[PDB]
Design a protein around this nucleic acid. Structure first.
Ligand SMILES: [Mg+2]
Ligand SMILES: [Mg+2]
Ligand SMILES: [Mg+2]
Ligand SMILES: [Mg+2]
Ligand SMILES: [Mg+2]
Ligand SMILES: [Mg+2]
Ligand SMILES: [Mg+2]
Ligand SMILES: [Mg+2]
Ligand SMILES: [Mg+2]
Ligand SMILES: [Mg+2]
Ligand SMILES: [Mg+2]
Ligand SMILES: [Mg+2]
Ligand SMILES: [Mg+2]
Ligand SMILES: [Mg+2]
Ligand SMILES: [Mg+2]
Ligand SMILES: [Mg+2]
Ligand SMILES: [Mg+2]
Ligand SMILES: [Mg+2]
Ligand SMILES: [Mg+2]
Ligand SMILES: [Mg+2]
Ligand SMILES: [Mg+2]
Ligand SMILES: [Mg+2]
Ligand SMILES: [Mg+2]
Ligand SMILES: [Mg+2]
Ligand SMILES: [Mg+2]
Ligand SMILES: [Mg+2]
Ligand SMILES: [Mg+2]
Ligand SMILES: [Mg+2]
Ligand SMILES: [Mg+2]
Ligand SMILES: [Mg+2]
Ligand SMILES: [Mg+2]
Ligand SMILES: [Mg+2]
Ligand SMILES: [Mg+2]
Ligand SMILES: [Mg+2]
Ligand SMILES: [Mg+2]
Ligand SMILES: [Mg+2]
Ligand SMILES: [Mg+2]
Ligand SMILES: [Mg+2]
Ligand SMILES: [Mg+2]
Ligand SMILES: [Mg+2]
Ligand SMILES: [Mg+2]
Ligand SMILES: [Mg+2]
Ligand SMILES: [Zn+2]
Lengths: 44, 120, 62, 119, 132
RNA sequence: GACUGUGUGGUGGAGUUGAUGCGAGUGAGAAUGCAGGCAUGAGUAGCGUGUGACGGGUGGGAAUCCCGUCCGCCGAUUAUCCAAGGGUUCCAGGGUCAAGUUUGUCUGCCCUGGGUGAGUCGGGUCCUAAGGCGAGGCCGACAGGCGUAGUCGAUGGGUAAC
RNA sequence: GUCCGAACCCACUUCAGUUGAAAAUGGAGGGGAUGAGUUGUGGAUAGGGGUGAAAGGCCAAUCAAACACCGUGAUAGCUGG
RNA sequence: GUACCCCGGGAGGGGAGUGAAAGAGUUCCUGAAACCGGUCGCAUGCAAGCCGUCAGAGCCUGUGUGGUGAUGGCGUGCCUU
């Protein structure tokens, strides 16, 4: 059947990309928190 | 000849019909065939009927044999080489010999061959 | 259904010991020049032959 | 001061599994099953140590009865006669006589017979 | 400790008796399926055993046969014994490393698959030791 | 009694005994307890729609690899080519621990090396839709909301090869 | 917003499946099939909120108030140890 | 960090070598229990068994103590609640 994950790289980058996170203070704090934890991937 | 009572070869009676025809044709083409015990023992009667028909050489007989077989090289072999070989033989044109088992599935194998020596 | 209890070692071994085979019997080749074991009513693997000592025939070229 | 339990813990397990060293199945292999069975074994053995007295007395009484009935006396009359005669040999030694020294037992039967009320 | 004769496989399987042995370790076959053939082969004459295992339909007959042959070869090299006067004195199968695997079942479930192994040990001796 | 010998071995290979005090992460059989390992069911159920047969080869080993011949099957698709998505799976050679619901000498697996070439094809370098962002600005305790001038944004317009 | 009927969309009945081939399907039929049709690409609405030809339906496989983290080791006159 | 030789396609093993030690051989210190087996002793195919306990022959062993144990009596698990 049709499943929940239908991949689109354009939509993924628009939704979770670095610039989307930088666009708002919540996303900037998410990037700061992922830096604090030490993730090698800060965003999509 | 006689039907086979139990479940047929190949998962369907049509496929067994085809398998037995092909196996008899291959036995006539090569003279001997390694074909597992049950297939050899099941194709012995049909092949013997075909050889008995091929013993007498007429156009109607060749057409009737060509109903089976359907390969005219095999019909030529059967009416030119195998058929004349059994002029004095009243039946028993083939023999089956057990050969061992297959490694992959333990299937008991056998060799069915057409009798190679003249009766006389 | 589903097993109600763990089967005891005695009963498990009672049933499991009956999962067994038999040894293959084997017969000596009637050919004097082969003398190797083969299955009864089966052509010899070593010489490819069949029949009694008097009237041998070749079944496999192996 | 973090302590590891194994060194102290295995002692009672070894003890219990040694006490269960003839049991059938899980009772001789697993500490929990062996512990349950040793609880039952201790209860049984304490009870049977007390019941042994009655069991052996019953056996002695049966043997004394059998040996005194061959002399035409019932066990109750034999015991009453030995009580009246004053011979305080207990049923253990009376049964030992009845098996090993039957002539001494028969003489004791005569002693008991002569000491009956006869009334 | 400071005692002589450190334990060895030969001292436990033979113990100064003439003969030899072989072990095939980590045979990628279950111990029970190997035992189904080892029970047939135990106590038999070694040459009869290898010829019979040449015809045994089971898949475990090919590993065990090799082990027997190796044992025979060892006895032909450290003891001077011939292959035709050897008999399989002892034979056993122990368990090896069992790999864990996952087979996906229905409804998002995964069932466990155990890939078992076996160590096969065969000890051969001269036929004169059968009654001694 | 919890337990224990300063008896006596085996294994082991670097710590630890007794007296008296001091401090505890100090004792487990159970919490549909947590982690690991291993049983029972059991050599049991299943091995995911189906048509294969034979001849020869390779090889330690072949129903399951390669070649050939018969036969069968799909054919508005079991064909061919793209988008999205994947990312080297592609090709050649070597391999058979693991993976492949069996075997495997085989492989979309492993290892080594190689392979993708545009003025014109699809995108950018051109254009805008929805929508987004948005100099100033207006609104809002703060945080922020909206929006002008603009600037992006194809799923469309334009643009030269067979 | 005609009729019969493929592709396509749906899901009425039945059988099977129920540790499935499948965390909703398969076989056989069945409804719509030029329309209030269906579908690709991108986009907008976000949790006491969205959206709803309205079933408390749907909002990433359990929605009469999603999910994640935090208050937090919530509290439980209850069960268990 | 196992030269060399033997069986094997390999894996593995057997000889040998290094090492104080290889049953320290790379799954490598020690190497418990569950669990899986080979061997030996006893018992076991007329028997109703919470699997024990007491009484008790016989056999093996006798390292004059230990293993098993026919047969008789008694005997309805553990925890929580
Ligand atoms: Mg019929
Ligand atoms: Mg079938
Ligand atoms: Mg038909
Ligand atoms: Mg039963
Ligand atoms: Mg009393
Ligand atoms: Mg799934
Ligand atoms: Mg102290
Ligand atoms: Mg504690
Ligand atoms: Mg515990
Ligand atoms: Mg537990
Ligand atoms: Mg099992
Ligand atoms: Mg079976
Ligand atoms: Mg069953
Ligand atoms: Mg069955
Ligand atoms: Mg089955
Ligand atoms: Mg082909
Ligand atoms: Mg067709
Ligand atoms: Mg690419
Ligand atoms: Mg590569
Ligand atoms: Mg890859
Ligand atoms: Mg490739
Ligand atoms: Mg390749
Ligand atoms: Mg495989
Ligand atoms: Mg290959
Ligand atoms: Mg615009
Ligand atoms: Mg501004
Ligand atoms: Mg643009
Ligand atoms: Mg475009
Ligand atoms: Mg209409
Ligand atoms: Mg209509
Ligand atoms: Mg609907
Ligand atoms: Mg969006
Ligand atoms: Mg309602
Ligand atoms: Mg949902
Ligand atoms: Mg709710
Ligand atoms: Mg609420
Ligand atoms: Mg609070
Ligand atoms: Mg060296
Ligand atoms: Mg050691
Ligand atoms: Mg170790
Ligand atoms: Mg009896
Ligand atoms: Mg009764
Ligand atoms: Zn022969």
């Amino acid at each position: 059947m049709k499943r929940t994950f239908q991949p689109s790289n354009r939509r993924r980058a628009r939704n979770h990309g670095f610039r989307s996170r930088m666009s708002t203070r919540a996303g900037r704090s998410i990037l700061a928190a992922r830096r604090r934890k030490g993730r090698v991937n800060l965003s999509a | 000849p006689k039907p086979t009572k139990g479940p047929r070869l190949g998962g369907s009676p049509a496929h067994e019909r085809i398998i037995l025809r092909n196996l008899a044709s291959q036995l006539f083409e090569h003279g001997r065939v390694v074909t597992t015990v049950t297939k050899a023992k099941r194709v012995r009667p049909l092949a013997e009927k075909l050889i008995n028909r091929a013993k007498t050489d007429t156009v109607a007989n060749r057409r009737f044999v060509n109903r089976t077989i359907t390969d005219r090289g095999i019909v030529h072999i059967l009416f030119t080489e195998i058929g004349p070989r059994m002029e004095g033989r009243d039946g028993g044109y083939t023999r089956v010999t057990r050969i061992g088992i297959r490694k992959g599935d333990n299937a008991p194998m056998a060799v069915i061959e057409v009798i190679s020596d003249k009766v006389a | 259904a589903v097993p109600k209890r763990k089967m005891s070692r005695s009963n498990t071994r009672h049933r499991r010991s009956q999962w067994k085979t038999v040894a293959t019997k084997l017969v000596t080749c009637a050919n004097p020049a082969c003398g190797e074991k083969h299955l009864p009513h089966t052509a010899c693997p070593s010489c490819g032959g069949y029949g009694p000592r008097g009237d041998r025939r070749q079944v496999v070229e192996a | 001061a973090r302590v590891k339990r194994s060194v102290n813990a295995k002692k009672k397990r070894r003890e219990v599994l040694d006490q269960a060293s003839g049991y059938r199945g899980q009772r001789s292999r697993l500490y929990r099953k062996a512990k349950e069975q040793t609880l039952h074994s201790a209860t049984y053995s304490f009870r049977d140590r007390r019941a042994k007295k009655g069991d052996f007395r019953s056996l002695w009484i049966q043997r004394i009865n059998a040996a005194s009935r061959a002399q035409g006396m019932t066990y109750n009359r034999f015991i009453n006669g030995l009580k009246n005669a004053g011979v305080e040999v207990d049923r253990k030694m009376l049964a030992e006589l009845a098996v090993s020294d039957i002539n001494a037992f028969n003489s004791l039967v005569e002693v008991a017979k002569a000491s009956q009320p006869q009334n | 400790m400071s005692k002589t004769e450190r334990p060895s496989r030969r001292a436990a399987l033979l113990g100064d008796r003439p003969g030899s042995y072989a072990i095939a370790r980590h045979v990628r076959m279950s111990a029970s399926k190997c035992r189904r053939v080892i029970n047939l082969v135990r106590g038999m004459d070694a040459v009869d055993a290898v010829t019979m295992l040449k015809f045994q339909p089971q898949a475990a007959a090919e590993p065990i046969r090799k082990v027997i042959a190796s044992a025979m070869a060892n006895a032909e090299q450290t003891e001077g014994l011939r292959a035709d006067d050897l008999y399989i004195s002892q034979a056993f199968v122990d368990e090896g490393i069992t790999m864990r695997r996952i087979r996906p079942r229905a409804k998002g479930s995964a069932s466990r698959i155990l890939k078992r192994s076996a160590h096969i040990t065969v000890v051969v001796e001269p036929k004169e030791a059968r009654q001694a």
